[PDB]
Write an enzyme that holds these catalytic residues in place. Structure first.
Site, PDB file in Angstrom:
ATOM      1  CE  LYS A  69      -2.270  -1.063   3.683  1.00 26.60           C
ATOM      2  NZ  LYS A  69      -1.744  -2.475   3.812  1.00 26.60           N
ATOM      3  CB  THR A  70       3.592   2.472   2.213  1.00 26.46           C
ATOM      4  OG1 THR A  70       2.846   2.445   3.429  1.00 26.46           O
ATOM      5  CG2 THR A  70       4.575   3.661   2.250  1.00 26.46           C
ATOM      6  CD  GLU A  81      -0.074   3.117   3.462  1.00 25.67           C
ATOM      7  OE1 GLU A  81       0.961   3.826   3.412  1.00 25.67           O
ATOM      8  OE2 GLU A  81      -0.253   2.172   4.270  1.00 25.67           O
TER       9      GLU A  81
HETATM   10  N1  LIG Z   1       2.765  -6.321  -3.950  1.00 24.86           N
HETATM   11  C1  LIG Z   1       3.390  -6.840  -2.852  1.00 24.86           C
HETATM   12  N2  LIG Z   1       3.099  -8.095  -2.478  1.00 24.86           N
HETATM   13  C2  LIG Z   1       3.710  -8.612  -1.397  1.00 24.86           C
HETATM   14  N3  LIG Z   1       4.602  -8.010  -0.629  1.00 24.86           N
HETATM   15  C3  LIG Z   1       4.897  -6.753  -1.007  1.00 24.86           C
HETATM   16  C4  LIG Z   1       4.330  -6.119  -2.104  1.00 24.86           C
HETATM   17  N4  LIG Z   1       4.864  -4.841  -2.221  1.00 24.86           N
HETATM   18  C5  LIG Z   1       5.708  -4.693  -1.232  1.00 24.86           C
HETATM   19  N5  LIG Z   1       5.758  -5.863  -0.466  1.00 24.86           N
HETATM   20  C6  LIG Z   1       6.529  -6.151   0.713  1.00 24.86           C
HETATM   21  O1  LIG Z   1       5.868  -5.482   1.829  1.00 24.86           O
HETATM   22  C7  LIG Z   1       6.871  -4.688   2.565  1.00 24.86           C
HETATM   23  C8  LIG Z   1       6.250  -3.378   3.108  1.00 24.86           C
HETATM   24  O2  LIG Z   1       5.725  -2.655   1.977  1.00 24.86           O
HETATM   25  P1  LIG Z   1       4.584  -1.408   2.008  1.00 24.86           P
HETATM   26  O3  LIG Z   1       4.482  -0.803   0.581  1.00 24.86           O
HETATM   27  O4  LIG Z   1       5.015  -0.459   3.186  1.00 24.86           O
HETATM   28  O5  LIG Z   1       3.263  -2.220   2.412  1.00 24.86           O
HETATM   29  P2  LIG Z   1       1.810  -1.858   3.183  1.00 24.86           P
HETATM   30  O6  LIG Z   1       0.717  -2.592   2.295  1.00 24.86           O
HETATM   31  O7  LIG Z   1       1.735  -0.305   3.163  1.00 24.86           O
HETATM   32  N6  LIG Z   1       2.108  -2.517   4.650  1.00 24.86           N
HETATM   33  P3  LIG Z   1       1.490  -2.148   6.311  1.00 24.86           P
HETATM   34  O8  LIG Z   1       1.163  -0.621   6.081  1.00 24.86           O
HETATM   35  O9  LIG Z   1       2.681  -2.462   7.286  1.00 24.86           O
HETATM   36  O10 LIG Z   1       0.172  -2.995   6.461  1.00 24.86           O
HETATM   37  C9  LIG Z   1       7.791  -4.318   1.447  1.00 24.86           C
HETATM   38  O11 LIG Z   1       9.062  -3.834   1.972  1.00 24.86           O
HETATM   39  C10 LIG Z   1       7.984  -5.680   0.788  1.00 24.86           C
HETATM   40  O12 LIG Z   1       8.854  -6.501   1.582  1.00 24.86           O
HETATM   41 MG   LIG Z   2       1.850   0.943   4.811  1.00 26.20          MG
HETATM   42 MG   LIG Z   3      -0.839  -4.078   7.904  1.00 25.22          MG
END
Ligand SMILES: Nc1ncnc2c1ncn2[C@@H]1O[C@H](COP(=O)(O)OP(=O)(O)NP(=O)(O)O)[C@@H](O)[C@H]1O
Ligand SMILES: [Mg+2]
Ligand SMILES: [Mg+2]
Length: 307
Positions: A118-119, A162
């Protein structure tokens, strides 16, 4: 955007908590008086002070002085003195996601959901709109390296945020377009898929959902969505497809195919096949919103990352 009826002072309980300071920053840039409180002083609280947001340390009932509304992260805990004082004094208390929902009211909101990425995806899409000179408001759960902030107010109609599935927070969002990057297991997994369906049902009937068709759990819930869907991924049956993918150390090169558009060669400045997929999600919304190929390429080629 319209004023909120009789809301001048907004107080964040646990403003150093995740997701809180970005909303506070945007509301402050809009002209609201923003105060907050937290258990322990931090780099988040020391900084919020540096931009004029008073941040009390320790929860005392008097910290909510002059506040018209309180913001808590998820649940309302009456044992918290600031929360308890607010209930005694009949001050409204909203969760973070509801306040984020109000930032999307009267804007063209894009909610980026999914278990992972997401981030990163929110950052990529935000950069794409910036490169098209569309000055978006954004609320990211992490430091955008190109701007040095989690969140900022823009002057356009766009806001990219997000959308957190935990505690079903994202059901408080009313977006005009949505992304679902993936639905990964590791309540019950079935309730969790239901909530992703509910989240997309918050789109208007004409709103766009951009989702990863490589994900079997997403494929499973598509017949339940009832909104315009565009699927992305590596698989052949996606509406948006990355082909000829080349992992080149810290960079990746791929070709994106889109209905009614000529193939487009791109480079994303981050490693990993998941980030090619994240870029496809952002490409999907950006294409629909009118972003040019040049803006999409510049955003991806020089992407500074998320801290
Ligand atoms: N499309 C994806 N599928 C699976 N893992 C991913 C993907 N994109 C990124 N990641 C992994 O997820 C880690 C955190 O990514 P981030 O873009 O911050 O996710 P998020 O969905 O915002 N997470 P959170 O906010 O902790 O619930 C990344 O450093 C990767 O290790
Ligand atoms: Mg995030
Ligand atoms: Mg989470």
């Amino acid at each position: 955007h319209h004023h909120m009826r009789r809301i001048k002072h907004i107080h964040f309980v646990g403003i150093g908590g995740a997701g809180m300071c970005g909303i506070a920053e945007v509301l402050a840039n809009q002209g609201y008086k923003i105060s907050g409180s937290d258990i322990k002083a931090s780099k988040t609280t020391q900084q919020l002070e540096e931009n004029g947001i008073k941040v009390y340390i320790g929860h005392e009932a008097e910290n909510i002085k002059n506040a018209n509304v309180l913001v808590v992260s998820t649940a309302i805990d009456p044992e918290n003195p600031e929360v308890k004082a607010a209930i005694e004094q009949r001050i409204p208390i909203v969760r973070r996601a509801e306040m984020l929902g109000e930032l999307m009211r009267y804007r063209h909101g894009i909610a980026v959901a999914g278990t992972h990425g997401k981030t990163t995806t929110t950052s990529l899409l935000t950069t794409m709109l910036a490169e098209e000179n569309l000055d978006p408001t954004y609320v990211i759960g992490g430091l955008l390296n190109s701007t040095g902030v989690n969140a900022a107010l823009g002057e356009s109609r766009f806001i990219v945020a997000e959308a957190d599935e935990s505690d079903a927070s994202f059901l408080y969002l009313q977006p005009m377009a949505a992304i679902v990057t993936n639905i990964d297991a590791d309540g019950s997994f079935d309730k969790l898929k239901d909530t992703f369906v509910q989240f997309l049902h918050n789109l208007p009937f004409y709103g766009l959902a951009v989702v990863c068709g490589d994900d079997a759990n997403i494929r499973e819930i598509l017949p339940r969505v009832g909104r315009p869907v565009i699927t992305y991924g590596f698989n052949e049956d996606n509406d948006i497809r990355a082909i000829d993918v080349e992992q080149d150390g810290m960079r990746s090169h791929f070709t994106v195919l889109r209905k009614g558009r000529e193939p487009l060669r791109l480079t994303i400045n981050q490693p990993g096949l998941h980030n090619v997929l994240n870029a496809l999600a952002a490409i999907g919304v950006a294409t629909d919103e009118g972003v040019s190929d040049e803006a999409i390429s510049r955003a991806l080629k020089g992407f500074s990352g998320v801290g």
